[PDB]
């Protein structure tokens, strides 16, 4: 050890996470916090329709929330309560177009019932002189509890397994999130037994722990980008795309 | 990551484990499931005759769930004083559950009439309000049992898991999704008497206590951290 | 046949134990339809914890 | 032919069978016979002393049949509300039956007197009217049993198949053939008390409930389609 010889290319090795045609890199090693083991396909128990995998198109990564994080945000403060099978659609219908323009999400437009495991990266691009630490935590069915308004805090979500982003080393939080819900399928549109809570798995919430602490001449901004891969998805119940209502703002 | 360990800086020698009390007390405690089957008070009511009820009439109905009831604190000095007991304090730590429950409903002494008890998996749970014991007919095809008061005034039950679900919600339920109300309680247990209108008047304001425990079928799901807690000695004393 | 042999001599109690939560067979009145029935966990429904 | 299949035009992949709930709930349900042995309310009466009855006097008599009674709806809120239960709804689907029945008659609390119960295979059933519970002596050679109220006020019974038949009619019986009245009920069960005239006055207007189930001997015959059905939520609410 102890021989850093930087050339024109910098020093470090640029590690890939190659997939279908969206390929994204980080300079730093991730800190994954897998909550649950990998689940079964679940197509044998409740779908006789054509249960078609779409790993060539749906396993692409997709940016769903970027946001500015400055030093004015206090200690125990939310940044983004992303509901992840919704926020993949909510970023689309927020971003001035329908579902049929994004090739990740057209099987949500066609098919009615969804299942699948998610991959979630929360990249930061902080300067090294900044001091701060975000946390990313996956929770299952946030909206199916009323008492999360007492829990929505860093001390509650620290007890469960959770990824950490230090703004010092500009760490990245990869975060495998396997699909686990009470019913083994999430619907994608208004469905005859529930309507409210459509395609809801729970909260990806990004709570500040250590705020940005810098000099007087410090870099105030710190943008945070969130990507999502959707790999072991299955789609079933083919129906017409005119039935698909817009997601909630 | 939560459970990572960056740099251990231990000073200690290795402790002799007691095997979780097996060495001293002759019994293990590491498995919390074997503590869960210790019975806990579920909800205590006071009988109150409103109408001259028919023999068919349920005397009280209540949803059946391991989450603990909507806590009903003249306060009940246990629910005023001993908050929540054990099983919802553990059940705070898990978002879902799946499994059986045991009940062992205890009836007072001055009652004599026969008791019918129903499981109703048809009944949903609409919100965390009205998820408590309700003082209000008998039905055919629901799973039923009659305990006779004269032999022994304590019925016992093994209420099974009848849901069309993978598991059910374990935190307190706000009824967001409309079909999700089908997936919180195991069903609805109803206790009703065969007492006529003359003799049920003596049984007014007699306590009927219900206990509960899980009974080896329960298997809790994905971990969720605890909510904020209240420390019980900080509760005020009754100034006299 | 007349069974004239003198019978058992027990003690009744009203309720099974409560603090016992272990290797102990507990008899109840199940509202399940089957006597050998037990709640089960299929291939995805086997819980993690 | 009914069950023929001209041209299958399936779109489906093959579904995983749950094995009729055995995979989820730990128990099968495909066999409807094992559901039939779940008890159902047979008929609930109210005691009514007409004469200063002798100790020999039957308090009520009723024919014994798995068809369900002539439904007696101050209405009884179950038979006003929960129509027919399960077992005549299945028994609508079969023209004949043959087998045992179980009863488990439940008696009220304030009674104390001894109870005698008879099976009478001599008694025919004359028409679908008067095929209900009838509030009216003890007999020797009929099959008998006494349950003591003071030990336990619920008798149980295994009433066998005593007919000189191949099987018996299962739909509602209009008494067309005169000897066919011998071939509908299993017989006639009578419940009578040993209470004297002074103490039976306290037991007036106390409910006596009778349950029923088949008990593994029952084997239904030739299929018959269902009759027209009434949908229960369409029944009106009690406007207050
Ligand atoms: O109350 C009693 C005690 C013993 N026994 C008999 O005595 C024998 C020894 O009893 P122990 O439970 O091994 C055995 O034959 C029993 O059946 C009774 O029948 N009744």
Short mmCIF file of N, CA and C in Angstrom, two decimals, chain D residues 14-146:
data_model
loop_
_atom_site.label_atom_id
_atom_site.label_comp_id
_atom_site.label_asym_id
_atom_site.label_seq_id
_atom_site.Cartn_x
_atom_site.Cartn_y
_atom_site.Cartn_z
N UNK D 14 -51.77 -23.11 -16.76
CA UNK D 14 -52.30 -23.96 -15.70
C UNK D 14 -52.05 -23.33 -14.34
N UNK D 15 -53.13 -23.16 -13.59
CA UNK D 15 -53.04 -22.55 -12.27
C UNK D 15 -52.45 -23.53 -11.27
N UNK D 16 -51.67 -23.01 -10.34
CA UNK D 16 -51.32 -23.80 -9.19
C UNK D 16 -52.55 -23.99 -8.32
N UNK D 17 -52.95 -25.24 -8.14
CA UNK D 17 -54.00 -25.51 -7.17
C UNK D 17 -53.45 -25.38 -5.77
N UNK D 18 -54.24 -24.80 -4.88
CA UNK D 18 -53.86 -24.76 -3.48
C UNK D 18 -54.16 -26.06 -2.76
N UNK D 19 -54.73 -27.04 -3.44
CA UNK D 19 -55.21 -28.21 -2.74
C UNK D 19 -56.38 -27.90 -1.85
N UNK D 20 -57.25 -26.98 -2.27
CA UNK D 20 -58.47 -26.60 -1.56
C UNK D 20 -58.15 -26.08 -0.16
N UNK D 21 -57.20 -25.15 -0.10
CA UNK D 21 -56.87 -24.48 1.14
C UNK D 21 -55.90 -25.21 2.03
N UNK D 22 -55.54 -26.45 1.69
CA UNK D 22 -54.56 -27.21 2.46
C UNK D 22 -53.20 -26.52 2.46
N UNK D 23 -52.84 -25.87 1.36
CA UNK D 23 -51.54 -25.21 1.29
C UNK D 23 -51.51 -23.94 2.12
N UNK D 24 -52.56 -23.12 2.06
CA UNK D 24 -52.57 -21.91 2.86
C UNK D 24 -52.95 -22.21 4.29
N UNK D 25 -54.17 -22.68 4.47
CA UNK D 25 -54.79 -22.68 5.78
C UNK D 25 -54.56 -23.97 6.54
N UNK D 26 -53.86 -24.93 5.93
CA UNK D 26 -53.56 -26.17 6.60
C UNK D 26 -54.71 -27.15 6.69
N UNK D 27 -55.68 -27.07 5.78
CA UNK D 27 -56.88 -27.90 5.86
C UNK D 27 -57.62 -27.91 4.53
N UNK D 28 -58.15 -29.08 4.17
CA UNK D 28 -58.87 -29.23 2.92
C UNK D 28 -60.34 -28.88 3.09
N UNK D 29 -60.99 -28.58 1.98
CA UNK D 29 -62.41 -28.25 1.97
C UNK D 29 -63.14 -28.82 0.78
N UNK D 30 -62.47 -29.60 -0.06
CA UNK D 30 -63.09 -30.13 -1.27
C UNK D 30 -64.21 -31.08 -0.92
N UNK D 31 -63.98 -31.95 0.04
CA UNK D 31 -65.01 -32.81 0.59
C UNK D 31 -66.00 -31.95 1.36
N UNK D 32 -67.23 -31.93 0.87
CA UNK D 32 -68.26 -31.13 1.52
C UNK D 32 -68.84 -31.85 2.72
N UNK D 33 -68.64 -33.16 2.78
CA UNK D 33 -69.11 -33.96 3.91
C UNK D 33 -68.42 -33.56 5.20
N UNK D 34 -67.15 -33.19 5.12
CA UNK D 34 -66.45 -32.76 6.31
C UNK D 34 -66.83 -31.35 6.71
N UNK D 35 -67.52 -30.62 5.84
CA UNK D 35 -68.13 -29.37 6.27
C UNK D 35 -69.49 -29.63 6.90
N UNK D 36 -70.15 -30.70 6.46
CA UNK D 36 -71.52 -30.96 6.90
C UNK D 36 -71.57 -31.30 8.39
N UNK D 37 -70.48 -31.83 8.93
CA UNK D 37 -70.40 -32.19 10.34
C UNK D 37 -70.13 -31.01 11.23
N UNK D 38 -69.91 -29.82 10.67
CA UNK D 38 -70.00 -28.61 11.45
C UNK D 38 -71.44 -28.37 11.87
N UNK D 39 -71.64 -28.13 13.15
CA UNK D 39 -72.99 -27.98 13.68
C UNK D 39 -73.66 -26.72 13.18
N UNK D 40 -74.98 -26.81 13.04
CA UNK D 40 -75.85 -25.73 12.60
C UNK D 40 -77.07 -25.74 13.50
N UNK D 41 -77.60 -24.55 13.79
CA UNK D 41 -78.85 -24.44 14.53
C UNK D 41 -79.98 -25.14 13.81
N UNK D 42 -80.67 -26.02 14.53
CA UNK D 42 -81.77 -26.79 13.98
C UNK D 42 -83.10 -26.08 14.22
N UNK D 43 -83.43 -25.78 15.47
CA UNK D 43 -84.63 -25.03 15.75
C UNK D 43 -84.71 -24.59 17.19
N UNK D 44 -84.95 -23.31 17.42
CA UNK D 44 -84.98 -22.73 18.75
C UNK D 44 -86.41 -22.48 19.17
N UNK D 45 -86.75 -22.91 20.38
CA UNK D 45 -88.11 -22.75 20.86
C UNK D 45 -88.11 -21.96 22.15
N UNK D 46 -89.31 -21.61 22.59
CA UNK D 46 -89.55 -20.98 23.87
C UNK D 46 -90.51 -21.87 24.65
N UNK D 47 -90.13 -22.21 25.88
CA UNK D 47 -90.95 -23.11 26.69
C UNK D 47 -92.26 -22.43 27.07
N UNK D 48 -93.33 -23.21 27.10
CA UNK D 48 -94.65 -22.65 27.40
C UNK D 48 -95.48 -23.73 28.08
N UNK D 49 -95.71 -23.56 29.38
CA UNK D 49 -96.50 -24.53 30.13
C UNK D 49 -97.97 -24.28 29.88
N UNK D 50 -98.65 -25.29 29.32
CA UNK D 50 -100.07 -25.17 29.01
C UNK D 50 -100.83 -25.79 30.17
N UNK D 51 -100.66 -27.07 30.45
CA UNK D 51 -101.35 -27.70 31.57
C UNK D 51 -100.39 -27.90 32.72
N UNK D 52 -100.93 -28.20 33.89
CA UNK D 52 -100.12 -28.67 35.01
C UNK D 52 -99.68 -30.09 34.67
N UNK D 53 -98.57 -30.17 33.94
CA UNK D 53 -98.17 -31.40 33.27
C UNK D 53 -97.69 -32.43 34.28
N UNK D 54 -97.98 -33.69 33.98
CA UNK D 54 -97.40 -34.79 34.73
C UNK D 54 -95.91 -34.89 34.41
N UNK D 55 -95.20 -35.63 35.27
CA UNK D 55 -93.78 -35.91 35.08
C UNK D 55 -93.55 -36.72 33.81
N UNK D 56 -94.54 -37.52 33.41
CA UNK D 56 -94.43 -38.31 32.19
C UNK D 56 -94.48 -37.45 30.94
N UNK D 57 -95.03 -36.23 31.03
CA UNK D 57 -95.39 -35.47 29.84
C UNK D 57 -94.16 -34.96 29.11
N UNK D 58 -94.12 -35.21 27.81
CA UNK D 58 -93.12 -34.60 26.96
C UNK D 58 -93.34 -33.11 26.91
N UNK D 59 -92.26 -32.35 26.99
CA UNK D 59 -92.43 -30.92 26.93
C UNK D 59 -92.48 -30.45 25.49
N UNK D 60 -91.66 -31.03 24.62
CA UNK D 60 -91.84 -30.78 23.20
C UNK D 60 -91.37 -31.99 22.41
N UNK D 61 -92.02 -32.19 21.27
CA UNK D 61 -91.68 -33.25 20.34
C UNK D 61 -91.31 -32.62 19.01
N UNK D 62 -90.42 -33.27 18.27
CA UNK D 62 -90.07 -32.77 16.95
C UNK D 62 -89.56 -33.90 16.08
N UNK D 63 -89.91 -33.91 14.80
CA UNK D 63 -89.36 -34.91 13.89
C UNK D 63 -87.90 -34.61 13.63
N UNK D 64 -87.15 -35.66 13.31
CA UNK D 64 -85.70 -35.59 13.22
C UNK D 64 -85.28 -35.88 11.78
N UNK D 65 -84.65 -34.89 11.15
CA UNK D 65 -84.36 -34.96 9.73
C UNK D 65 -83.25 -34.00 9.36
N UNK D 66 -82.43 -34.35 8.36
CA UNK D 66 -81.34 -33.45 7.98
C UNK D 66 -81.78 -32.41 6.99
N UNK D 67 -83.07 -32.37 6.67
CA UNK D 67 -83.55 -31.47 5.63
C UNK D 67 -83.63 -30.04 6.13
N UNK D 68 -83.48 -29.83 7.43
CA UNK D 68 -83.86 -28.56 8.02
C UNK D 68 -85.35 -28.48 8.26
N UNK D 69 -85.72 -27.77 9.32
CA UNK D 69 -87.13 -27.75 9.69
C UNK D 69 -87.94 -26.88 8.75
N UNK D 70 -89.26 -27.04 8.85
CA UNK D 70 -90.15 -26.00 8.39
C UNK D 70 -89.81 -24.73 9.13
N UNK D 71 -89.29 -23.76 8.40
CA UNK D 71 -88.57 -22.65 9.01
C UNK D 71 -89.53 -21.73 9.75
N UNK D 72 -89.35 -21.64 11.06
CA UNK D 72 -90.19 -20.83 11.93
C UNK D 72 -89.48 -19.51 12.13
N UNK D 73 -89.91 -18.49 11.39
CA UNK D 73 -89.42 -17.14 11.62
C UNK D 73 -89.88 -16.66 12.99
N UNK D 74 -92.92 -10.63 17.18
CA UNK D 74 -91.61 -11.01 17.69
C UNK D 74 -91.08 -12.18 16.87
N UNK D 75 -90.30 -11.89 15.83
CA UNK D 75 -89.68 -12.97 15.06
C UNK D 75 -88.37 -13.39 15.69
N UNK D 76 -87.96 -14.62 15.40
CA UNK D 76 -86.62 -15.05 15.74
C UNK D 76 -85.66 -14.38 14.77
N UNK D 77 -84.74 -13.57 15.29
CA UNK D 77 -83.95 -12.68 14.44
C UNK D 77 -82.98 -13.45 13.57
N UNK D 78 -82.62 -14.67 13.96
CA UNK D 78 -81.81 -15.50 13.09
C UNK D 78 -82.64 -16.01 11.91
N UNK D 79 -83.81 -16.59 12.17
CA UNK D 79 -84.59 -17.12 11.06
C UNK D 79 -85.33 -16.02 10.33
N UNK D 80 -85.44 -14.84 10.93
CA UNK D 80 -85.87 -13.72 10.13
C UNK D 80 -84.74 -13.22 9.26
N UNK D 81 -83.51 -13.27 9.78
CA UNK D 81 -82.38 -12.60 9.15
C UNK D 81 -81.49 -13.59 8.41
N UNK D 82 -80.95 -14.60 9.10
CA UNK D 82 -80.03 -15.54 8.48
C UNK D 82 -80.83 -16.75 8.00
N UNK D 83 -81.16 -16.73 6.72
CA UNK D 83 -82.06 -17.73 6.18
C UNK D 83 -81.34 -19.05 5.98
N UNK D 84 -81.92 -20.11 6.55
CA UNK D 84 -81.68 -21.53 6.26
C UNK D 84 -80.35 -22.12 6.70
N UNK D 85 -79.33 -21.30 6.92
CA UNK D 85 -78.00 -21.82 7.14
C UNK D 85 -77.44 -22.65 6.00
N UNK D 86 -76.60 -23.63 6.38
CA UNK D 86 -75.80 -24.36 5.38
C UNK D 86 -76.50 -25.63 4.94
N UNK D 87 -76.86 -26.46 5.90
CA UNK D 87 -77.14 -27.87 5.61
C UNK D 87 -78.40 -28.09 4.77
N UNK D 88 -79.50 -27.33 4.92
CA UNK D 88 -80.53 -27.46 3.89
C UNK D 88 -80.17 -26.79 2.59
N UNK D 89 -79.18 -25.90 2.58
CA UNK D 89 -78.77 -25.34 1.31
C UNK D 89 -77.99 -26.36 0.50
N UNK D 90 -77.20 -27.20 1.16
CA UNK D 90 -76.61 -28.32 0.44
C UNK D 90 -77.67 -29.37 0.16
N UNK D 91 -78.55 -29.61 1.13
CA UNK D 91 -79.52 -30.68 1.03
C UNK D 91 -80.60 -30.38 0.01
N UNK D 92 -80.70 -29.13 -0.44
CA UNK D 92 -81.48 -28.82 -1.62
C UNK D 92 -80.93 -29.50 -2.86
N UNK D 93 -79.63 -29.74 -2.91
CA UNK D 93 -79.01 -30.31 -4.08
C UNK D 93 -79.03 -31.80 -4.21
N UNK D 94 -79.79 -32.52 -3.39
CA UNK D 94 -79.83 -33.96 -3.47
C UNK D 94 -81.23 -34.45 -3.16
N UNK D 95 -81.78 -35.31 -4.00
CA UNK D 95 -83.15 -35.76 -3.78
C UNK D 95 -83.25 -36.72 -2.61
N UNK D 96 -82.22 -37.51 -2.35
CA UNK D 96 -82.33 -38.48 -1.26
C UNK D 96 -81.12 -38.38 -0.36
N UNK D 97 -81.20 -39.10 0.75
CA UNK D 97 -80.10 -39.19 1.71
C UNK D 97 -80.24 -40.52 2.43
N UNK D 98 -79.17 -40.91 3.12
CA UNK D 98 -79.23 -42.04 4.05
C UNK D 98 -78.11 -41.96 5.07
N UNK D 99 -78.43 -41.85 6.35
CA UNK D 99 -77.35 -41.85 7.32
C UNK D 99 -77.77 -41.28 8.65
N UNK D 100 -76.77 -41.13 9.52
CA UNK D 100 -77.02 -40.74 10.89
C UNK D 100 -77.17 -39.24 11.01
N UNK D 101 -77.55 -38.81 12.20
CA UNK D 101 -77.56 -37.41 12.57
C UNK D 101 -77.09 -37.27 14.01
N UNK D 102 -76.52 -36.11 14.31
CA UNK D 102 -76.07 -35.77 15.65
C UNK D 102 -76.88 -34.58 16.12
N UNK D 103 -77.09 -34.45 17.43
CA UNK D 103 -77.98 -33.36 17.81
C UNK D 103 -77.42 -32.32 18.77
N UNK D 104 -76.94 -32.73 19.94
CA UNK D 104 -76.36 -31.82 20.94
C UNK D 104 -77.36 -30.74 21.35
N UNK D 105 -78.45 -31.16 22.01
CA UNK D 105 -79.48 -30.22 22.43
C UNK D 105 -78.98 -29.44 23.64
N UNK D 106 -79.13 -28.12 23.61
CA UNK D 106 -78.64 -27.24 24.67
C UNK D 106 -79.84 -26.71 25.44
N UNK D 107 -79.77 -26.76 26.76
CA UNK D 107 -80.84 -26.38 27.66
C UNK D 107 -80.47 -25.12 28.43
N UNK D 108 -81.45 -24.34 28.91
CA UNK D 108 -81.11 -23.09 29.58
C UNK D 108 -80.52 -23.30 30.96
N UNK D 109 -80.22 -22.19 31.62
CA UNK D 109 -79.48 -22.26 32.87
C UNK D 109 -80.39 -22.44 34.07
N UNK D 110 -81.53 -21.77 34.09
CA UNK D 110 -82.37 -21.76 35.27
C UNK D 110 -83.14 -23.05 35.47
N UNK D 111 -83.15 -23.94 34.47
CA UNK D 111 -83.73 -25.25 34.67
C UNK D 111 -82.75 -26.09 35.50
N UNK D 112 -83.30 -27.03 36.27
CA UNK D 112 -82.49 -27.92 37.09
C UNK D 112 -82.94 -29.36 36.95
N UNK D 113 -84.18 -29.55 36.50
CA UNK D 113 -84.80 -30.87 36.51
C UNK D 113 -84.15 -31.80 35.49
N UNK D 114 -84.36 -33.09 35.70
CA UNK D 114 -83.78 -34.10 34.83
C UNK D 114 -84.52 -34.15 33.51
N UNK D 115 -83.81 -34.54 32.46
CA UNK D 115 -84.31 -34.45 31.10
C UNK D 115 -84.27 -35.82 30.47
N UNK D 116 -85.41 -36.27 29.95
CA UNK D 116 -85.43 -37.49 29.17
C UNK D 116 -85.71 -37.18 27.71
N UNK D 117 -85.04 -37.93 26.85
CA UNK D 117 -85.00 -37.71 25.41
C UNK D 117 -85.24 -39.05 24.72
N UNK D 118 -86.17 -39.07 23.77
CA UNK D 118 -86.58 -40.28 23.08
C UNK D 118 -86.34 -40.17 21.58
N UNK D 119 -85.98 -41.31 20.99
CA UNK D 119 -86.08 -41.54 19.56
C UNK D 119 -87.27 -42.45 19.30
N UNK D 120 -88.13 -42.05 18.37
CA UNK D 120 -89.32 -42.82 18.03
C UNK D 120 -89.35 -43.07 16.53
N UNK D 121 -88.80 -44.18 16.06
CA UNK D 121 -88.88 -44.48 14.63
C UNK D 121 -90.26 -44.91 14.16
N UNK D 122 -91.23 -45.04 15.07
CA UNK D 122 -92.60 -45.33 14.67
C UNK D 122 -93.27 -44.14 14.00
N UNK D 123 -92.87 -42.92 14.36
CA UNK D 123 -93.64 -41.76 13.95
C UNK D 123 -93.35 -41.39 12.51
N UNK D 124 -94.40 -41.24 11.74
CA UNK D 124 -94.31 -40.76 10.37
C UNK D 124 -94.31 -39.25 10.35
N UNK D 125 -94.13 -38.68 9.17
CA UNK D 125 -94.24 -37.24 9.03
C UNK D 125 -95.35 -36.89 8.05
N UNK D 126 -96.43 -36.31 8.56
CA UNK D 126 -97.61 -36.02 7.76
C UNK D 126 -97.52 -34.59 7.22
N UNK D 127 -96.99 -34.46 6.01
CA UNK D 127 -96.93 -33.19 5.33
C UNK D 127 -95.81 -32.30 5.83
N UNK D 128 -95.46 -31.32 5.00
CA UNK D 128 -94.43 -30.37 5.40
C UNK D 128 -94.92 -29.43 6.48
N UNK D 129 -96.21 -29.14 6.51
CA UNK D 129 -96.77 -28.51 7.69
C UNK D 129 -96.82 -29.53 8.81
N UNK D 130 -96.75 -29.03 10.05
CA UNK D 130 -96.51 -29.83 11.26
C UNK D 130 -95.27 -30.71 11.12
N UNK D 131 -94.24 -30.19 10.45
CA UNK D 131 -92.92 -30.80 10.47
C UNK D 131 -91.97 -29.86 11.19
N UNK D 132 -92.44 -29.27 12.27
CA UNK D 132 -91.65 -28.34 13.06
C UNK D 132 -91.71 -28.79 14.51
N UNK D 133 -91.09 -27.99 15.38
CA UNK D 133 -91.11 -28.28 16.80
C UNK D 133 -92.50 -28.03 17.35
N UNK D 134 -93.01 -28.97 18.15
CA UNK D 134 -94.37 -28.91 18.66
C UNK D 134 -94.34 -28.97 20.18
N UNK D 135 -94.88 -27.94 20.82
CA UNK D 135 -95.04 -27.90 22.27
C UNK D 135 -96.33 -28.65 22.61
N UNK D 136 -96.20 -29.84 23.20
CA UNK D 136 -97.38 -30.62 23.53
C UNK D 136 -98.15 -29.99 24.67
N UNK D 137 -96.44 -38.85 26.25
CA UNK D 137 -95.89 -39.31 27.51
C UNK D 137 -94.54 -39.97 27.28
N UNK D 138 -93.81 -40.17 28.37
CA UNK D 138 -92.63 -41.02 28.38
C UNK D 138 -93.02 -42.44 28.00
N UNK D 139 -92.11 -43.15 27.36
CA UNK D 139 -92.41 -44.47 26.87
C UNK D 139 -91.28 -45.43 27.22
N UNK D 140 -91.60 -46.72 27.17
CA UNK D 140 -90.63 -47.73 27.59
C UNK D 140 -89.65 -48.10 26.48
N UNK D 141 -90.16 -48.73 25.43
CA UNK D 141 -89.26 -49.44 24.55
C UNK D 141 -88.58 -48.59 23.52
N UNK D 142 -88.94 -47.32 23.42
CA UNK D 142 -88.22 -46.42 22.54
C UNK D 142 -86.83 -46.16 23.11
N UNK D 143 -85.90 -45.87 22.22
CA UNK D 143 -84.53 -45.60 22.63
C UNK D 143 -84.47 -44.28 23.40
N UNK D 144 -83.90 -44.34 24.60
CA UNK D 144 -84.07 -43.28 25.57
C UNK D 144 -82.72 -42.85 26.11
N UNK D 145 -82.69 -41.64 26.67
CA UNK D 145 -81.53 -41.18 27.41
C UNK D 145 -81.94 -40.03 28.32
N UNK D 146 -81.37 -40.00 29.52
CA UNK D 146 -81.61 -38.91 30.47
C UNK D 146 -80.32 -38.13 30.61
#
